[PDB]
Design a protein around this ligand. Structure first.
Ligand SMILES: CNC(=O)c1cc(Oc2ccc(NC(=O)Nc3cc(C(C)(C)C)nn3-c3ccc4ncccc4c3)c(F)c2)ccn1
Length: 321
C-alpha cells in the first residue's frame, strides 16, 4: 500500500507454546506473510480470544516499513470505527526481542485458497461473487477516503472469515495479471488502479480463471487491448515506458522474437462467452452473469478517467437488482 543482505537479516522463529507480551499464547503457524512469521495465538489477557500476530524482522528497512504499515492501519481503523468497509483490523502492537509485532483480528483463509478448494477452473457461485464485489467496492471507498492506494489487489491479498461471508482486504508473480495498463505504460496513476484490479479479481472469482494471464508486460497490454481496442493516444503519450510498447506513430508493437506493428487492435475477447463457459444456466443466474459482464465492461476501461466510480459500482445492477 502507498500514500496518494542487511535488509533480510533478523528473522525470528517463534516457538509453539511461547508467550509473547505476557499474554499471547502461540499455538500455530499460518504460512502467510512473505518476510515475517505470522502466527496464531490466544490472548490470555482478553478471554483467550484468537488473534494473528505478525513478527517483523529485526532490521532497519523492515522496522521502518512496519511502522508505515502500522500508520496506514491506524488511519483506516480511525476512519472506520465500526468496521463497515472491509479492511483488515489491527488490534494493537508490541515489541519482542527487537521485533515489531502487529496483532490482527483472526481470519480463516485467503481467496486464492478458497478458489483452489473449488477446483480447477470452477469458480464461486454468482451470489458469492455479488456479495464479495460489494465488500470490495466498500474497501475501495475507504482506501480512497484515506488517500491510500493498494496497488496489488488480487485473491491472495483478500482474506475471509470461517463462514466465508465476510472478506477483508489486506496486503502482504501473480501480481502482473492484475496490473492496470497505466502502470504498465508508466503513466501517472490514481485510485483507478485498484478498481481495475478488483475487476480482474471478480472475473477470476466467477470463472476460476485469470482474466489476463500475460507472460510479459507487453502481452498484458495486448490482452487488455484485445478486450477494449487500442489504448487512447493521449494515454500512450504520457507513459514513460511507451517506447517499450509503441512506436513514434503510436502504433502498438506486439512482441511474439518477432515484432508485429499494429495501428488498430480489433476487440476479439468475448467476455460473456468466457463468463458463461459450458454452463446451461437458468434465466435468473443468466441475467446476473450478463450484469457481471456489464460491470466488468465499465471497470476495465483502458483510460482510468473513464472507469466506473466506486459509488456507481456499488449501485450497479449486478449488486442492486
Ligand atoms: C488464522 N489466521 C490467519 O491466518 C491470519 C493471518 C493474518 O495475516 C496477516 C494479514 C495481513 C497483514 N497485514 C496487512 O494486511 N497490512 C496492510 C493492510 C493494508 C490495507 C488495509 C491498506 C490494504 N495495507 N497493509 C500494508 C502492508 C504492508 C505495508 N508496508 C509498508 C507500508 C504500508 C503497508 C501497508 C498481516 F500483517 C498479517 C491476519 C489474520 N489472520
Amino acid at each position: 500500500s502507498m500514500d496518494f543482505w542487511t535488509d533480510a537479516e533478523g528473522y525470528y522463529r517463534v516457538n509453539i507454546g511461547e508467550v509473547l507480551d505476557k499474554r499471547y499464547n502461540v499455538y500455530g503457524y499460518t504460512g502467510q506473510g512473505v518476510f515475517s512469521n505470522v502466527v496464531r495465538a490466544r490472548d490470555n489477557a482478553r478471554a483467550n480470544q484468537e488473534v494473528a500476530v505478525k513478527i517483523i524482522r529485526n532490521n532497519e528497512l523492515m522496522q521502518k516499513t512496519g511502522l508505515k504499515e502500522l500508520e496506514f492501519l491506524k488511519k483506516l481503523n480511525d476512519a472506520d470505527p465500526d468496521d463497515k468497509f472491509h479492511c483488515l483490523r489491527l488490534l494493537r502492537h508490541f515489541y519482542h526481542k527487537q521485533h515489531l509485532c502487529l496483532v490482527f483480528e483472526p481470519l480463516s483463509m485467503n481467496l486464492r485458497e478458497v478458489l483452489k478448494k473449488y477446483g480447477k477452473d470452477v469458480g464461486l457461485h454468482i451470489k458469492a461473487v455479488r456479495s464479495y464485489s460489494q465488500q470490495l467496492f466498500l474497501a475501495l471507498k475507504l482506501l480512497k477516503r484515506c488517500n491510500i492506494l493498494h496497488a496489488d489487489i488480487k485473491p491472495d491479498n483478500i482474506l475471509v472469515n470461517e463462514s466465508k461471508t465476510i472478506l477483508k482486504l489486506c496486503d502482504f508473480l501473480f501480481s502482473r495479471f492484475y496490473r492496470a495498463p497505466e502502470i504498465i505504460i508508466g503513466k501517472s496513476y490514481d485510485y483507478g488502479i485498484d478498481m481495475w484490479s478488483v475487476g480482474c479479481t471478480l472475473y477470476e472469482l466467477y470463472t476460476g480463471k485469470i482474466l489476463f494471464p500475460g507472460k510479459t508486460n507487453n502481452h498484458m497490454l495486448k490482452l487488455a487491448m484485445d478486450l477494449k481496442g487500442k489504448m487512447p493516444n493521449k494515454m500512450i503519450r504520457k507513459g514513460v515506458f511507451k517506447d517499450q510498447h509503441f512506436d513514434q506513430n503510436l502504433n502498438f508493437m506486439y512482441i511474439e522474437e518477432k515484432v508485429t506493428v499494429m495501428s488498430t487492435i480489433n476487440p476479439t475477447k468475448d467476455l460473456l462467452a468466457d463468463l458463461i463457459g459450458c454452463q446451461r444456466l437458468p434465466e435468473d443466474q443468466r441475467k446476473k452473469v450478463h450484469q457481471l459482464k456489464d460491470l466488468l465492461d465499465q471497470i476495465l476501461m483502458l483510460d482510468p478517467a473513464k472507469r466506473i466510480s466506486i459509488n456507481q459500482a456499488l449501485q450497479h445492477a449486478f449488486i442492486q437488482e
